[PDB]
Design a protein around this ligand. Structure first.
Ligand SMILES: *[C@@H]1O[C@H](CO)[C@@H](O)[C@H](O)[C@H]1NC(C)=O
Length: 494
């Protein structure tokens, strides 16, 4: 029903000038003008910005250069304060049941959890001023060149309705504090500078949950991805569709239907989880209800679910991107017969997600939480064949989720411990892994190879890895959480 493609381009002569910090407008201008005094390039100008972030010191600047760009950007990059210069990009988002009760958000509503005092933000095409399905819109800041805060196609209205609503289409969280970020034009066009200014204002606003519908391989570039990491690092639980989502720090979301099938519009394992994204209903542009089926649809489903889950939690101190991701995956109900690269840890379960989140203790975790190369079809393609000595190492890139801190570290070299009675000693596994873990997460890549004594052997070798993640005290002593990763493999003669 609804298809979300993308395309991007670079706009000639315009550059994002990322700074080594957060500067006032004149400081940015003076750094750039000195760096262009050392240089021989004269034909340059700052292309200034009019929006709610213009009233704030910034960590970037948009400039034009037409005469000689290589010398200009090389000289600017060589400026001390100027971290990086990257071209401006132009993206084009091609848009082509009581679900909260079908997930039993009634039971949470019944307890008195509705989304109160949770700032969720929609990075979409806006929300009309006089929509009756909402009660707590706080602001409708704009970031486009179009002079409208309202929604001209609805997608933003549909997303906001699913997250929050009180009418013929019920939203997951009625009492959420809504923040509308019109980052797309009524033609679905945006710019990296628009997104960067909007992300900066989202950081200033301190928005707990962000539903993000921006993708494309080129557009998620160095300033973009860095700003995403900085939001997640500022405790911005981000939710996006896989179609940022496929990054380490964002809750990626896939889409099933109401019969728990994988829909026809549906490395490390992503999505994290799935939920309903076919036949879902949400608010109309001025009013009414409408149903949409597509990949983008489950993302607001999970975003609403997360907003409600955040309201569920007594002490908000414990809610971060990693702990929320951990709950979505631990509570997840596995779909029988779906591999890990379509469903992640299992379709969303709002009530058991609420249960884990209610009992959750700060700790590190792995995704996948175990290795079993003989578990077809979940662990596919690793079960397409067993590991035979003389073959390339089996490499599994494991996400670490450090719910103990935005910064943490592997304390030492992760230890592979084979079971002797189960002849785990017939494999060796090496670790090539990111050392420091930021933000809220890291990675651990494991390269499994059979040993020499079992070149002519057939059977199941087993063992575990004993990793340890440390991160400073967030409450002192480091916060340490050792995590066993069971490993099970079937070996054969070469
Ligand atoms: C694991 O994933 C990360 C992505 O964050 C990547 O940079 C790294 O190279 C991967 N490791 C291996 C061994 O592929």
């Amino acid at each position: 029903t609804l298809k979300v493609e993308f395309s991007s381009t670079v706009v000639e002569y315009e550059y994002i000038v990322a700074f080594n910090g957060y500067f006032t407008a004149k400081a940015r201008n003076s750094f750039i003008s000195s760096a262009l005094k050392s240089s021989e390039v004269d034909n340059w100008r700052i292309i200034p910005r009019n929006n709610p972030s213009s009233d704030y010191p910034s960590d970037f600047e948009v400039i034009q250069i037409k005469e000689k760009q290589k010398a200009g950007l090389l000289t600017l990059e060589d400026h001390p304060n100027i971290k990086r210069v990257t071209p401006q990009r132009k993206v084009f988002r091609s848009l082509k049941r009581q679900v909260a009760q079908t997930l039993q958000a009634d039971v949470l509503w019944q307890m008195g959890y509705t989304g109160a005092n949770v700032r969720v933000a929609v990075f979409d095409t806006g929300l009309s001023e006089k929509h009756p399905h909402f009660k707590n819109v706080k602001e409708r800041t704009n970031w486009t060149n179009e002079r409208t805060l309202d929604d001209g196609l609805g997608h933003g209205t549909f997303v906001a309705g699913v997250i929050a609503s009180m009418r013929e289409c019920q939203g997951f969280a009625p009492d959420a504090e809504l923040h509308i970020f019109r980052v797309f034009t009524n033609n679905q066009v945006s710019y990296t500078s628009w997104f960067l200014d909007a992300f900066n204002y989202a950081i200033l606003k301190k928005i707990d949950v962000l539903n993000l519908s921006i993708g494309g391989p080129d557009f998620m570039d160095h300033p973009f991805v860095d700003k995403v990491w900085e939001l997640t690092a500022n405790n911005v639980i981000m939710v996006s569709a896989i179609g940022p989502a496929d990054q380490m720090d964002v809750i990626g979301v896939g889409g099933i239907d109401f019969e728990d099938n994988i829909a026809r519009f549906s490395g490390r394992m992503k999505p994290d989880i799935v939920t309903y994204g076919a036949g879902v209903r949400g608010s109309g542009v001025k009013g009414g209800c409408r149903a949409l089926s597509g990949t983008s649809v489950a993302s607001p489903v999970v975003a609403g679910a997360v907003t409600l889950l955040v309201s569920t939690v007594q002490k908000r101190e414990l809610v971060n991107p990693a702990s929320m991701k951990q709950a979505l995956i631990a509570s997840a109900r596995r779909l029988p017969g779906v591999n890990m690269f379509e469903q992640g840890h299992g379709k969303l379960d709002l009530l058991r997600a609420y249960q884990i989140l209610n009992s959750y203790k700060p700790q590190a975790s792995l995704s996948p939480s175990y290795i079993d190369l003989t578990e077809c079809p979940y662990m596919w393609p690793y079960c397409s064949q067993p590991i035979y000595y003389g073959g390339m190492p089996t490499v599994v890139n494991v996400t670490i989720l450090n719910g103990m801190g935005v910064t943490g570290r592997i304390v030492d070299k992760p230890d592979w411990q084979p079971y002797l009675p189960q002849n785990g000693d017939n494999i060796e596994v090496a670790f090539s892994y990111s050392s420091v873990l930021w933000p809220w997460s890291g990675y651990l890549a494991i390269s499994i190879s059979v040993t020499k004594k079992a070149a002519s052997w057939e059977g199941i070798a087993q063992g575990h890895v004993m990793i340890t993640v440390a991160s400073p005290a967030e409450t002192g002593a480091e916060q340490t959480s050792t995590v066993k990763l069971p490993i099970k493999v079937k070996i054969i003669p070469t």
